[PDB]
Design a protein around this nucleic acid. Structure first.
Ligand code: BA
Ligand code: BA
Ligand code: BA
Ligand code: BA
Length: 345
DNA sequence: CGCTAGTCGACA
DNA sequence: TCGACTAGCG
């Protein structure tokens, strides 16, 4: 996500309880709970031992939400965006490297620091997620697998009014333009809410409380799609945008050295990357639960060629998208693994 | 000041 | 995988 984003914007946060959303619909970044629940069984997962502790963990928050008369929508990650296909396979190996230290330290007498490495060799698989889905469906709780990043899917549900808020631990959800976010929510419903309208109560931001500018700042500060120019963080990135009153972000970026009173030359690999990163936050493919069709997160503008946005995600027959979204089609093999039909229940 | 990239803790 | 917390470097 965005390094230190929450701390930068903490002026816009607010302690709340989920009861607040009684009678309403809330989308969940279920992965966050999955990872946390995976912690309790990192050891067992590695040895291939049969563990389901992360399922019960996810259900604890789910049943907490239901007990307060809340309608949860569990959203899950899907395929890996092109353009991060590489940056991700990269983790594949480092996540396997840390799984090596555990095994040696466990056979030395140290079982205390060996375990610290297993938490970092934790691999949240699709099969693990599918288990959680079966549990949720069994309590009548709706589940939705995003075509690509749950971030965009979650953002879409919120902007479309399907859900009134999003429960997540992820910072760069705001960058996708979602209105209400609930961070740090615990088992009992005590969370820390961030409303997009309260961005204006951040002095540090100043004039960059608009969604477009807020997004430019986040990217300049350094996102997943594009690392920032080294020496640029939230404050500097904010400063540039908060200073240059020019609707032409392209020309603005090429003057970064001028605004910061620094001396940086704006490479070519970055100006293009910013355009792509931006197109990824705007137009990443999501699934419209209502019509049942694959769509971009935002309607295309008049200055965007859709045929060039393969890096934000590739389309598929809406039927294929439906089976993936329902959690029937395996992500990697595109091989059906379940026979679930939302219409018949 | 603020960045950065560094480590370190998350659960129980 | 993330975010939080710090040590030093503009
Ligand atoms: Ba993310
Ligand atoms: Ba996420
Ligand atoms: Ba950075
Ligand atoms: Ba301005």
């Amino acid at each position: 996500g965005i390094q230190g984003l929450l701390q930068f914007i903490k002026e816009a946060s607010e302690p709340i309880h989920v009861r607040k959303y009684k009678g309403q619909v809330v989308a969940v970044d279920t992965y966050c709970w999955l990872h946390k629940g995976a912690i309790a069984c990192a050891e067992k997962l590695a040895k291939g031992e049969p563990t389901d502790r992360y399922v019960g963990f996810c259900m604890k928050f789910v049943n907490m939400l239901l007990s307060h008369g809340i309608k949860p929508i569990l959203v899950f990650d899907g395929c890996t965006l092109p353009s991060k296909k590489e940056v991700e396979r990269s983790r594949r190996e480092r996540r396997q490297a840390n799984l090596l230290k555990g095994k040696q330290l466990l056979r030395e007498g140290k079982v205390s620091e060996a375990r610290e490495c297993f938490t970092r060799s934790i691999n949240i698989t699709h099969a693990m997620a599918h288990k959680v889905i079966k549990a949720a469906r069994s309590q009548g709780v709706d589940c939705l697998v995003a075509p690509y990043e749950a971030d965009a899917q979650l953002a879409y549900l919120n902007k479309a009014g399907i859900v009134q808020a999003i429960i997540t631990e992820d910072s760069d959800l705001l960058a996708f333009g979602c209105k209400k976010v609930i961070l740090k929510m615990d088992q009992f419903g005590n969370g820390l809410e961030i409303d997009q309208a309260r961005l204006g109560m951040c002095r540090q931001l100043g004039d960059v409380f608009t969604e477009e500018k807020f997004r430019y700042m986040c990217i300049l500060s350094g996102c997943d799609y594009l690392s920032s120019l080294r020496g640029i963080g939230l404050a500097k990135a904010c400063k540039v945008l908060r200073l240059a009153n020019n609707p032409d972000i392209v020309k603005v970026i090429k003057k970064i050295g001028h605004y910061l009173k620094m001396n940086i030359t704006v490479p070519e690999d970055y100006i293009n990357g910013f355009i792509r990163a931006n197109n990824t936050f705007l137009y990443q493919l999501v699934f419209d639960p209502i019509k049942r069709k694959l769509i971009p997160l935002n309607a295309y503008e008049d200055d965007v060629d859709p045929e060039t946005l393969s890096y934000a995600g590739q389309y598929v027959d809406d039927s294929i998208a439906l089976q993936i979204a329902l959690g029937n089609k395996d992500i990697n093999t595109f091989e059906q693994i379940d026979d679930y039909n939302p219409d018949t229940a």
